[PDB]
Design a protein around this ligand. Structure first.
Ligand SMILES: Cn1nc(C(C)(C)C)cc1NC(=O)Nc1ccc(Oc2ccncc2)cc1
Length: 338
């Protein structure tokens, strides 16, 4: 029986107490979150700077425990250059009564696209970053995982503009796909692609593509760009009141993204045209978008790997006790290996 595992030291970071193994030193506050808090650390073994997320009361309720367990499994499962990954997992706990939280160790990423958004962005930078997003998205989608909430803040970058896809947690819906906002038809993996389009557009222009007070105001702003959709799309809607409403609009024709984005190159506008597509059957997939000529100078098919196995959480549907979730999280931590 112990207070904490041997080789664990106690230390305040951002006015909260942290419990870190001796191998991780110089903890430095990065940010506070909805479900935890992050610091940066130096791994004395190799001198590399890492990020560490402290889970905040993950066992306060079944919802929290399942959430914390899910993030742990996703990060473990994803093995790709442009997806954030797990380097290590630990808890200072020595038993199950002792188990109150756990920590995740990840590659440290200096900043994100939200923070550096507004440096005008040359096409080469956009080409390079959007190419990395798409690779990351091809990978996770190939594992059967969709992001659903992709945005500049969920896109981490370093000095070299190397990109890693994040999901910081779970209002503004500027990057959300219309079919999600309006639930007017069922969505597929290309919901994330609509988000890439919105982000790319913003990098091209400097300004957010689609805002709005409410969903109908955002739909209006969207249709300005996509034009009012015709017969083939309207038929697919499962929302009668939406189908009606659309058919009642001034049927304003679409596009010439050359006009809408008067600075964009023909290949840029063309790809934009294909990601910002209302019909979720016509919208580009990640693998399809990777083949676009816009990524000609950067494309390397070997880099565009897929997940070997699908993300398979047998307990996404289960409903066990907080104690029961602790036992499973406990097990996953014990048998982890770098
Ligand atoms: C739930 N979920 N899903 C994903 C996929 C993208 C693989 C689908 C990732 C996460 N969790 C996460 O990003 N956690 C996280 C993000 C940022 C962070 O803080 C930093 C990490 C690295 N560098 C700086 C800050 C800490 C944890």
């Amino acid at each position: 029986s112990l207070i904490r595992k041997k080789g664990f030291y106690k230390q305040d970071v951002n006015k909260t107490a942290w419990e870190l193994p001796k191998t991780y030193v110089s903890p430095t506050h990065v940010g506070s979150g909805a479900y935890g808090s992050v610091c940066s650390a130096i791994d004395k073994r190799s001198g590399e700077k890492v990020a560490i997320k402290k889970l905040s009361r993950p066992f306060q309720s079944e919802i929290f425990a399942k959430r914390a367990y899910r993030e742990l499994l996703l990060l473990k499962h994803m093995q790709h250059e442009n997806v954030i990954g797990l380097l290590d997992v630990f808890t200072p706990a020595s038993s199950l009564r002792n188990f109150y939280d756990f920590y995740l160790v990840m590659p440290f990423m200096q900043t994100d696209l939200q923070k550096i958004m507004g440096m005008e962005f040359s096409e080469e930078k956009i080409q390079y970053l959007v190419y990395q997003m798409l690779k990351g998205l091809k990978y996770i989608h190939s594992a059967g995982v969709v992001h659903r909430d992709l945005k500049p803040g969920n896109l981490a970058v370093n000095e070299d503009c190397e990109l890693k896809i994040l999901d910081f947690g779970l209002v503004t819906r500027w990057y959300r796909a219309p079919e999600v906002i309006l639930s007017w038809m069922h969505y597929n993996q290309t919901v994330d692609i609509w988000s890439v389009g919105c982000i790319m557009a913003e990098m091209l222009t400097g300004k957010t593509l689609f805002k709005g007070k409410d969903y109908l105001d955002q739909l209006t702003q969207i249709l300005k760009v996509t034009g009012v959709p015709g017969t083939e799309f309207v038929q697919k809607l499962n929302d009668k009141a939406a189908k009606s409403y659309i058919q009642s609009l001034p049927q304003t024709p679409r596009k010439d993204f050359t006009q809408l984005f008067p600075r964009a190159s023909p290949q840029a506008a063309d790809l934009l045209e294909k990601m910002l597509e209302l019909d979720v059957d016509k919208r580009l997939t990640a693998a399809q978008a990777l083949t676009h000529p816009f990524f000609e100078p950067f494309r390397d098919p070997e880099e565009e790997t897929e997940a070997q196995q699908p993300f398979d959480d047998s307990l996404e549907h289960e409903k066990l006790t907080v104690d029961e979730w602790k036992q499973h999280i406990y097990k996953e931590i014990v048998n982890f290996s770098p």
